[PDB]
Amino acid sequence: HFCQICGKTFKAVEQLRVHVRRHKGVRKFECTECGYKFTRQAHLRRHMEIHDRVENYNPRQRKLRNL
């Protein structure tokens, strides 16, 4: 099973389908300090661990890897 966007093959349609969901680029998780939007909750909780290290943290919006 492959995708018409990347051509990346997937051994199961269950995880190919969650890959096509990554194409719409839904960023529903936002940091309540620097306003940066995230695709996963785990990406947000890992991000605050660095907000405790440094005081002045503000990254630029990074690009998603697949369109």
Add this chain to the structure above:
DNA sequence: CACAAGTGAGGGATCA
């Protein structure tokens, strides 16, 4: 501005 190295966000996996 190339270049290396350190950085952290994106995205793949199994599973409840």
Add this chain to the structure above:
DNA sequence: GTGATCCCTCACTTGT
């Protein structure tokens, strides 16, 4: 549709 986790990537970032 979640999401949690383990982890490897790779674009930014920094320094030379």
